[PDB]
CSV table of C-alpha atoms in Angstrom, one decimal:
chain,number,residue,atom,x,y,z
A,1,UNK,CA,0.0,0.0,0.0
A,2,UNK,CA,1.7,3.6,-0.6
A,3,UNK,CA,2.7,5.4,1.7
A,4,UNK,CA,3.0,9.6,2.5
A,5,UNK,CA,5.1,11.5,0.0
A,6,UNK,CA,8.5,11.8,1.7
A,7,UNK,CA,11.7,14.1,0.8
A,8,UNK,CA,13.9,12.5,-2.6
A,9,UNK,CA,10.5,10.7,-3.9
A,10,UNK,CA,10.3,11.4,-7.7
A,11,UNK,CA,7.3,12.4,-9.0
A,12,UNK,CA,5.2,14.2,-12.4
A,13,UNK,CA,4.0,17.4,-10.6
A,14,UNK,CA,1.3,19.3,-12.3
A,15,UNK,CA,0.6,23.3,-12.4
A,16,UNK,CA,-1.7,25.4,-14.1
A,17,UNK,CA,-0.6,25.7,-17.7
A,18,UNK,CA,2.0,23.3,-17.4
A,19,UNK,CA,2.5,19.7,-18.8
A,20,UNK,CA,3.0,16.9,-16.2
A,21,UNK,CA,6.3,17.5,-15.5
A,22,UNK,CA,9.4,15.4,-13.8
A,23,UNK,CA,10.6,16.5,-10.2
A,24,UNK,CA,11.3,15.4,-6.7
A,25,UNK,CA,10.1,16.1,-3.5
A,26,UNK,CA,12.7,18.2,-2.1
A,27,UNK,CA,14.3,18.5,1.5
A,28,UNK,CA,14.0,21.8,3.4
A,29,UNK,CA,17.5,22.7,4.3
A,30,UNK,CA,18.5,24.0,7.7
A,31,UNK,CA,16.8,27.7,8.2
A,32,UNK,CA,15.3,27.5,5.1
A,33,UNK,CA,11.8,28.7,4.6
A,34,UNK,CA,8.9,25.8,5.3
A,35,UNK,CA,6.2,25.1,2.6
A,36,UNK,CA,2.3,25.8,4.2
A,37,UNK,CA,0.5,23.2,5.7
A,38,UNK,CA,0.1,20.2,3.9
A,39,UNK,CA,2.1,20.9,1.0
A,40,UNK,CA,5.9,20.0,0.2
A,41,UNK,CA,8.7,22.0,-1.5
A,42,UNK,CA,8.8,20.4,-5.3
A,43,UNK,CA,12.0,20.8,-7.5
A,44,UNK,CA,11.4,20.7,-11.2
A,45,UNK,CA,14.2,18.7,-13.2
A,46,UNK,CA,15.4,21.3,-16.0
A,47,UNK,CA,14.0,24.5,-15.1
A,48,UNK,CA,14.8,23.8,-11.3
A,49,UNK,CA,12.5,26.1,-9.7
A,50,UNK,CA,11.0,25.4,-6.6
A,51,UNK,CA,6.7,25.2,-5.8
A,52,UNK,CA,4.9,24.1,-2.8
A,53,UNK,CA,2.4,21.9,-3.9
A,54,UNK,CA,0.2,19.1,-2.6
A,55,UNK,CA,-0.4,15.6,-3.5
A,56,UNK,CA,-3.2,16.4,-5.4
A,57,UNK,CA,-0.8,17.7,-8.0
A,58,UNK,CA,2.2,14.9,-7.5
A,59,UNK,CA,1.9,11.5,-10.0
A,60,UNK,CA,4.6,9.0,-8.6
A,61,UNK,CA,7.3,8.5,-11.4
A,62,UNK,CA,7.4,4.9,-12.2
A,63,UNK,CA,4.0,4.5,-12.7
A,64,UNK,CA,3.5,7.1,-15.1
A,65,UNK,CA,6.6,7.6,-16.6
A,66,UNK,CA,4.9,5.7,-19.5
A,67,UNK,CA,2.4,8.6,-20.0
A,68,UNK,CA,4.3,11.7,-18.9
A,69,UNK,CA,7.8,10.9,-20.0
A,70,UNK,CA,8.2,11.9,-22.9
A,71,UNK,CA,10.0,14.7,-24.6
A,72,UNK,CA,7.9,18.3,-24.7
A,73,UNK,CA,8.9,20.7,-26.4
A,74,UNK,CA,8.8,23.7,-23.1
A,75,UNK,CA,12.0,25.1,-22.3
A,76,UNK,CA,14.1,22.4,-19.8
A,77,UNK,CA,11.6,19.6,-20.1
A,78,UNK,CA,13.9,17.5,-21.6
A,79,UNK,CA,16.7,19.0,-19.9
A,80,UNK,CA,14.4,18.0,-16.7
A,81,UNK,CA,13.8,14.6,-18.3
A,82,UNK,CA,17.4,13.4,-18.3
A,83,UNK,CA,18.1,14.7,-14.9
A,84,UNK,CA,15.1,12.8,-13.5
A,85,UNK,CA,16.4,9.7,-15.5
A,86,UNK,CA,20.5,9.3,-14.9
A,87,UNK,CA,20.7,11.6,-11.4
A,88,UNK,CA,17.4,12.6,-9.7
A,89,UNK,CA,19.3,12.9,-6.4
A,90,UNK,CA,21.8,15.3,-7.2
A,91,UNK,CA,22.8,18.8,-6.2
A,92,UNK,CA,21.2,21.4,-8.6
């Protein structure tokens, strides 16, 4: 059965006007600011901006990967595409 969202889970995340697009559910780093209630700080492979979102917004990766990973032609999707593919976890 799935569990809570937790920090380094990849993800498609959708906003407004966007496609479903490849990020992770970030960390909060030491004194940095804290998303709202109920919503998580998501980093977007490519673009690497930061949103607080909710899991009504957050596909898990694997399963839709299929439908959502493919390339798109918005500036850093496929940038975000490889990053979500060969090093999700890394420093950006």
């Amino acid at each position: 059965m799935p569990h809570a969202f937790k920090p380094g889970d990849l993800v498609f995340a959708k906003m407004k006007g966007y496609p479903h697009w490849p990020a992770r559910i970030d960390d909060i780093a030491d004194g940095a600011v804290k998303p709202p209630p109920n919503k998580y700080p998501i980093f977007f492979f490519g673009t690497h901006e930061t949103a607080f979102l909710g899991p009504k917004d957050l596909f898990p990766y694997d399963k839709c990967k299929d439908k959502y990973g493919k390339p798109n032609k918005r500036k850093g999707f496929n940038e975000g595409l490889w990053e979500i593919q060969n090093n999700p976890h890394a420093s950006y």
